[PDB]
């Protein structure tokens, strides 16, 4: 409910983000066409999601900063930093969709699949990343936490890219990769590719903005948040195959793309030798009938039911971590995030 | 000669760069495979060039810092910042080669063309970019110019990406784009895509490291350097078609790629209406015989000789700018760069 309360306000501020990021068209008109492109890229790729990561910045800031310190300018900085996290997500998704051969995202054709865009989307993606640091400069440069935020975003990006490296290394095209698909490898991939930027980053950013800079407070927050991120990525992998695409907004490519998904890991742990062979002959290939055979195997092994049980046990574990590590931060900071992600269908 | 003096020392420090960037394999072994990938990406893509941009940092630092202040640790910071510029170049080239459909670079097949790499090179490129900020943290975080360097690299990246946007917008695949190929557009593209990061960045970085942070000194340096960058990109465009590939290390794709090259701009200024039509029917297309026809037109219009004359007049103009704007910096700082770029065959 705390996310829904802030959502309209948050999305309304996108206009101002776009206006501020396109405002150099005024002083350097020679870059006009490029700024028009950047606006198109922002409108297509930074809108249409759920805004969970950016909204988390704003909700956390409200909960962590004394209300007498939530002046107009401070709140605007908070909505701007939330939008920075959304721009990071947009950078990542544009590039990921290329690398994953994806078709749709957030209910529309991926940006790179648009006629006339193609591999120029590489540059578009990187432009989105640059916009983060332009926003941080424009709004936060005189604040004591400016450097902490720059470094947090840079570090989060590095960690995420390292995860993406592990994801791509574990999933080579055209090679049987089943031996590589272990729980230990899975946990390492998702910690780096998803958990740092999707969970630690937004809460950390709010913490820094609230003046909470201590190593121990950041570490304790991290303990909760990285585990939440692991669950989130497990959910994401489950939904890639079993999610309703009218809800998720995107077609799944994990099977065709040979990915170390939580699904294929759980399949491997349960498979008879005959099933192992079915998996080997059908995984990591573009043929629709081979993708169908893998899904049928997962259903044979009751993986949906194993997921539902896992979601229950994971929720309980994260709540136990909140009891242990939330203090001295309000537990509502973590509880509002848990509510948002658990039982998520998108 | 000042570049040759520093070159061996500079390249010898690459081992240490790689060692420092791969040293977290020790403390977080779960990312071992990713760090092994990053090492392969660094070895393939950050070596084999001329190192002009990174060496410029080191030469400038030597010339701008009092010799009694060039202690071991300071010099190491200077070689590290030079390598940061080289890593930026490597990020850019890996991604550019994808976007331009290039075949070779620095004498070998482009990284993305390597079997088993492909569009995973998108992530590789971005990893190179992240390494810049990891190096700046590791070596320069306690220095008074740390924030100035972070912001300079971020800004240079943004400007470069804006230029790349103009480059791609002006060169749409499959569309006749001749009307867009003007001198004014050309000058704007190359200022952003090349001149900021290739000329202003390395000298500015050295300036900041020497404690020269003034807006006016940075502006005057910029006046020289952006014009030098324009010449450099004109040279690059000339060499794309007329350079010896055994020297340049890369096959030209500007004609096939529909680019706003200096060549096609100069062609348009000189072309009869019949020649205009030959250009229209043959430019921006992959057919080798059509590329051949454009080259033959350029030679008919004596464009090599127009380039040689342009190089002479440009050299004189840049030298006049040095006389005007070098002070109070040593003119050798700019003169050593001019010597390196003029009469360049690579
Ligand atoms: C430089 C750029 C390539 O770096 C990144 C780009 C994208 C990502 C990333 C991280 C986490 N999730 C995604 N996307 C998900 P999604 O496609 O949204 O289901 P995944 O492909 O991992 O299943 C992408 C991480 C890094
Ligand atoms: C995000 C990434 C796409 O951003 C960039 C990548 C590359 C470049 C860039 C800038 C200047 N020169 C190059 N390459 C040259 P080159 O291929 O080396 O002849 P150009 O293709 O412009 O003729 C690339 C600029 C931006
Ligand atoms: Mg994906
Ligand atoms: Mg992916
Ligand atoms: Mg997914
Ligand atoms: Mg190129
Ligand atoms: Mg190019
Ligand atoms: Mg070129």
From Swiss-Prot, chains A, B:
It comes from the Eukaryota. Dimethylallyl diphosphate binds at residues 105, 193-194, 233, 250, 259. The chain holds residues 74 to 419 of 419 of the full protein. One of its GO terms (cellular component) is cytosol. Key enzyme in isoprenoid biosynthesis which catalyzes the formation of farnesyl diphosphate (FPP), a precursor for several classes of essential metabolites including sterols, dolichols, carotenoids, and ubiquinones. FPP also serves as substrate for protein farnesylation and geranylgeranylation. Catalyzes the sequential condensation of isopentenyl pyrophosphate with the allylic pyrophosphates, dimethylallyl pyrophosphate, and then with the resultant geranylpyrophosphate to the ultimate product farnesyl pyrophosphate. The lineage of its organism: Eukaryota, Metazoa, Chordata, Craniata, Vertebrata. The gene is FDPS. Binds 2 Mg(2+) ions per subunit. It is found in: Cytoplasm. Its EC number is 2.5.1.10, 2.5.1.1. Belongs to the FPP/GGPP synthase family. Mg(2+) 2 binds at residues 96, 100. Homodimer. Interacts with RSAD2. Keywords: Acetylation, Cholesterol biosynthesis, Cholesterol metabolism, Cytoplasm, Disease variant, Host-virus interaction, Hydroxylation, Isoprene biosynthesis, Lipid biosynthesis, Lipid metabolism, Magnesium, Metal-binding, Steroid biosynthesis, Steroid metabolism, Sterol biosynthesis, Sterol metabolism, Transferase. GO terms for biological process: cholesterol biosynthetic process; farnesyl diphosphate biosynthetic process; geranyl diphosphate biosynthetic process. Mg(2+) 1 binds at residues 96, 100. This is Farnesyl pyrophosphate synthase. The keyword Oxidoreductase does not apply. Isopentenyl diphosphate binds at residues 50, 53, 89, 106.
């Amino acid at each position: 409910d705390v996310y829904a309360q802030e959502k309209q306000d948050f999305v309304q501020h996108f206009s101002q983000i776009v206006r501020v990021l396109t405002e150099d068209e005024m002083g350097h008109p020679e870059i006009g066409d490029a700024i028009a492109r950047l606006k198109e890229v922002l409108e297509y790729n930074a809108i249409g999601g759920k805004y969970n990561r950016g909204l988390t910045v704003v909700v956390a800031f409200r909960e962590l900063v004394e209300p007498r310190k939530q002046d107009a300018d401070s709140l605007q900085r908070a909505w701007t930093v939330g939008w920075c996290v959304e721009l990071l997500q947009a950078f990542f998704l544009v590039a990921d969709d290329i690398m994953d051969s994806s078709l749709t995202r957030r209910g529309q054709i991926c940006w790179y699949q648009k006629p006339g865009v193609g591999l120029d989307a590489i540059n578009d993606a990187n432009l989105l990343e640059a916009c983060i640091y332009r926003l941080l400069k424009l709004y936060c440069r005189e604040q004591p936490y400016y450097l902490n935020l720059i470094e947090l975003f840079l570090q989060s990006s590095y960690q995420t890219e390292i995860g993406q490296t592990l994801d791509l290394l574990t999933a080579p095209q055209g090679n049987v990769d089943l031996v590589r698909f272990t729980e230990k490898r899975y946990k390492s991939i998702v910690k780096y590719k998803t958990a740092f930027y999707s969970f630690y980053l937004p809460i950390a950013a709010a913490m820094y903005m609230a003046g909470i800079d201590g190593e121990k407070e950041h570490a304790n927050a991290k303990k909760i948040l990285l585990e939440m991120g692991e669950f989130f990525q497990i959910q994401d992998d489950y939904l890639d195959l079993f999610g309703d695409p009218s809800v998720t907004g995107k077609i799944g490519t994990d099977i065709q793309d040979n990915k170390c998904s939580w699904l294929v890991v759980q399949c491997l742990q349960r498979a008879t030798p005959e099933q192992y062979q079915i998996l080997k002959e059908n995984y990591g290939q573009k043929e629709a009938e081979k993708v169908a055979r893998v899904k049928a195997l997962y259903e044979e092994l009751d993986l949906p039911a194993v997921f539902l049980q896992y979601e229950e046990d994971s929720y309980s574990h994260i709540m136990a971590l909140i009891e242990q590590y939330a203090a001295p931060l309000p537990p509502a900071v973590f509880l509002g995030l848990a509510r948002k992600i658990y039982k998520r269908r998108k």
